Symmetry: C3
Subunit: 232 residues, 3 copies
């Protein structure tokens, strides 16, 4: 039972690109069907880290659930949660991915961010977030009132620090700057911790994946050895 | 002739996890047998770099030898070589991997470390080392008497610098901090150089691998093309 | 129709190692034939990034064209374009890769470099460049009159900053220092931007690749699923 998907890419589907009306009551799947030359992927162009592995850790999924992880109403009273960009306009209305929140400062200097989530779903949780990369220091200051910020993400098995690189690139969809996307799988019983002083796009929704026994570690090269074994 | 292994992972076996009584007169093997859901892997939880490739560069091995590379008695007269952690307790006794030495300072400021080894085994040598990542600056100071240190590893074909990131993670096996593992293959005739001013877990033992003709470059994706060729 | 290649590696061929007389009227190919234990690869030893993927993005190619991207005569009036090294000596004459230019300063402090190229070939363009890593600060100063420099490379889909690490390694081909190689595929209509204040080896020639329909994204793991599908 292959999952049916339109003119969108997996990145668009998982990030929550408004242009993709994929919000349907679909649970498990054996395959993902994707247009070989998709258009509706990332609203704000940029690099999607480990994109190949995310089409291998979701190549076969059992029970699949979308749930809210960090509600905008209560999670960030001291920050702006309306980082809307006309980069894309569903119904001609500027909007952002429906699973992410682009946070900015207000009144004074961007207040420090310290939040965490504990996985009590009894399933592995896929958490997605981004890092903002301004085209200019003046724009970085406009959003965060600083010229120097970092994003740190910590879990039991994954730990990385992200540094924003300010530089102007060729315009893509009229964007001079760029957003990079990162993700990790949070094991049951663990905690994901986010710490930042600016240039953070926070997770809003997260996905719980049963996975089942359709794969091994899920990583690619582990979805081939099994395919070869099946032929042999 | 598959290699028999208990409830341990390859990481545990190669690092020297005391809980794994795998110290047997075993040389060559055609396969590695590993429990699909292993428990006895890394004593001090953390990230193991390039773990998939180390189960592909050792997927098929001819002559295999464990030898001492940097003896604790003579290699570090100016450092502590007893970085024991109760993280694990063989016979209920706190101990560390039997192939690695966690070095710390003594008396004064952690003395600078400059050591090297020349490969004269006529075989490729697998060298493993780690980098310490404190949960707090106070703990970094307790061990090294500094708040700023780096680890540099240089060879003919591999050259990387490691920077420790101090941050507290969720406790794993009661550990607030974390150790990352790195490795490289040193070609015959080359030299591996270690330079550091703190936060280093030095290699103690190293492995000489004949490898033979059971693989190509050894890298994965090079252990599949050959498998497909065999089917075809 | 496999491409015939001598005692050289792909890295040597694409970089332009003088010792490799592969400058022939060869266009498309279905396979690349390479000596399993090649000798004539990189003149100045060092690390070649993403080398496996460059033997998978060129595993099958249709029309293939070598063209000049940044002519030495007009592109750098304020820099030295004769960074010759005796590392190798075709006809016993010190020379450098015939697709790269090792730039150095002159008279005063290495002038800042800002250059770009727009892809109007209607084909994907493969751009190669390098980063210099001195064995000593004194040598870095001799070439660039500085002790601190960086290289930044920006495109629509790729954006990375390179930091040189000064350290002495074991001599390889009598070289105490080392050069690392990096590359990216520039899509039609995009622009590649190079910005640096030292330690840059600039692209001189670039390749236009038709590619055709002999592969998918071209990435490895995407050249295997197709091979397995063919068997099945
Ligand atoms: C994809 O685009 C084509 C052409 O506009 C359209 O006919 C098709 O319905 C689209 N797919 C979906 C799911 O809307
Ligand atoms: C979605 O794809 C259509 C082409 O069918 C394009 O016109 C539109 O701009 C795309 N929107 C986004 C957000 O990519
Ligand atoms: C917002 O700032 C006030 C200090 O003015 C602080 O007491 C409060 O806890 C902060 N709220 C959040 C969510 O950080
Ligand atoms: C966030 O906390 C760090 C110390 O951990 C501090 O140096 C930094 O200035 C704080 N951020 C802001 C905007 O004050
Ligand atoms: C692995 O664990 C099981 C269950 O305790 C035990 O019976 C088995 O002997 C263990 N394997 C080894 C090699 O000790
Ligand atoms: C080894 O595995 C056993 C479970 O059989 C567990 O109780 C013990 O704590 C583990 N020791 C280490 C060092 O992982
Ligand atoms: C230990 O320190 C002394 C200086 O007090 C130095 O002479 C000696 O060479 C050092 N030994 C090592 C192994 O670094
Ligand atoms: C190690 O040597 C470097 C210079 O290469 C020096 O800056 C550093 O302070 C030394 N380490 C210690 C603990 O003094
Ligand atoms: C490769 O080296 C061998 C041995 O010197 C030589 O005979 C052969 O002609 C070389 N290949 C090419 C293309 O020159
Ligand atoms: C090319 O290979 C030959 C061995 O046939 C070797 O003697 C020569 O030094 C190599 N030249 C380069 C630039 O690698
Ligand atoms: C060379 O330097 C002069 C300033 O003396 C500047 O006007 C000129 O544009 C520079 N040329 C290039 C190619 O950077
Ligand atoms: C290159 O420009 C930067 C500012 O973007 C400046 O800080 C740097 O010093 C310049 N390089 C040189 C050699 O002056």
């Amino acid at each position: 039972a292959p999952l049916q998907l339109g003119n969108c890419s997996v990145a668009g589907w998982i990030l929550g690109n408004p242009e993709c009306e994929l919000l349907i009551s679909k649970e498990s799947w054996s395959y993902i069907v994707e247009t070989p030359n998709p258009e509706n992927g990332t609203c704000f162009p940029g690099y999607f880290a480990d994109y190949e592995e995310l089409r291998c850790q979701l190549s076969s999924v059992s029970s699949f659930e979308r749930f809210e992880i960090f509600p905008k109403e209560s999670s960030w009273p001291n920050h702006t949660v309306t980082g809307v960009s006309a980069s894309c306009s569903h119904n001609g209305k500027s909007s952002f991915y429906r699973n992410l929140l682009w946070l900015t400062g207000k009144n004074g200097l961007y207040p420090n961010l310290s939040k965490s989530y504990v996985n009590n779903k009894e399933k592995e949780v896929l958490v997605l977030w981004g890092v903002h990369h301004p085209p200019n220091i003046g724009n970085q200051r406009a959003l965060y009132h600083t010229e120097n910020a970092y994003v740190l993400v910590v879990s039991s098995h994954y730990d990385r620090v992200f540094t924003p690189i300010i530089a102007k690139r060729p315009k893509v969809r009229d964007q001079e700057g760029r957003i990079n996307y990162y993700w990790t799988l949070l094991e049951p019983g663990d905690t994901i911790i986010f710490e930042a002083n600016g240039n953070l796009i926070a997770p809003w929704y997260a996905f719980a994946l049963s996975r089942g026994f359709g794969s091994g570690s899920g990583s690619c090269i582990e979805h081939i050895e099994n395919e070869i074994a099946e032929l042999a």
